[PDB]
């Protein structure tokens, strides 16, 4: 694509520079270009890809929620009409967000997931697929909302099955997956009891496996366990 003439290694190097510069749109374009070289990604390269797009879409979601809230305020009873502008600009941001999600899902489909044989890579990518369908679901309202949700559910569920079979309970990828799937359940699928159950079981099974870890792995796993607890504290 736009990055077809740059070396894979240079794109990865420049993704790392862009991260240091907090240039996440650049970071994402470089990692898109690296993915499209057609080689599978290393653990570090997968994380560069995810961090880049997570930062880009995070900005769009934050903006969308601001605009959505204004728009709902402007449609409540007793509100001075202000015309189409809020709706139009909310749609503008929403469309750009959906474009980013579609781009990421395209990379996963063509062909990161099908070439990911190892559990740590396949679970990572399936979690990402669930995540970006979840971001689509956050803004969906039409005849495709239910299918978007089920696409997220299906991706998360395949990732859960593999992780439960192939990874220890403290594996940070497995833990981050369960965290995000539980949030899916809570506020996307409107299944709060499923969300709470998944988070508790995930936390408790990790806690019982911490004894097997080095100090560095312990730090990685407990960091995500704290997020599970943070949510449970709000949900219970």
């Amino acid at each position: 694509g736009a990055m077809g003439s740059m070396e894979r290694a240079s794109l990865i190097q420049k993704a790392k520079l862009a991260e240091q510069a907090e240039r996440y749109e650049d970071m994402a374009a470089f990692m898109k270009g690296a993915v499209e070289k057609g080689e599978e990604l290393s653990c570090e390269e997968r994380n560069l890809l995810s961090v880049a797009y997570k930062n880009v879409v995070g900005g769009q979601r934050a903006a969308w929620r601001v605009l959505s809230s204004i728009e709902q305020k402007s449609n409540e009873e007793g509100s001075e009409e202000k015309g189409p502008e809020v709706r139009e600009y909310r749609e503008k941001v929403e469309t750009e967000l959906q474009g980013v999600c579609d781009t990421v899902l395209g990379l996963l489909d063509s062909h990161l997931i099908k070439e990911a044989g190892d559990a740590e890579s396949r679970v990572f990518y399936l979690k990402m697929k669930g995540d970006y369908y979840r971001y689509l679901a956050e803004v969906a309202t039409g005849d495709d909302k239910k299918r978007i949700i089920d696409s997220a559910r299906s991706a998360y569920q395949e990732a859960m099955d593999i992780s439960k079979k192939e990874m220890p309970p403290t594996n940070p990828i497995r833990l981050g997956l369960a965290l995000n799937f539980s949030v899916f359940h809570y506020e996307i699928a409107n299944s709060p009891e499923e969300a709470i159950s998944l988070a508790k079981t995930t936390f408790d099974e990790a806690m019982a496996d911490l004894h097997t870890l080095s100090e560095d792995s312990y730090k990685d796993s407990t960091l995500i366990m704290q997020l599970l607890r943070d949510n449970l504290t709000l949900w219970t």
Binding site: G58, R65, K127, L179, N180, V183, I224, L227, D230, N231
Partner: peptide, 10 residues
């Protein structure tokens, strides 16, 4: 909206 904790940045 109250955003719950999910994996990774932002």
């Amino acid at each position: 909206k109250l955003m719950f904790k999910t994996e990774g940045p932002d």
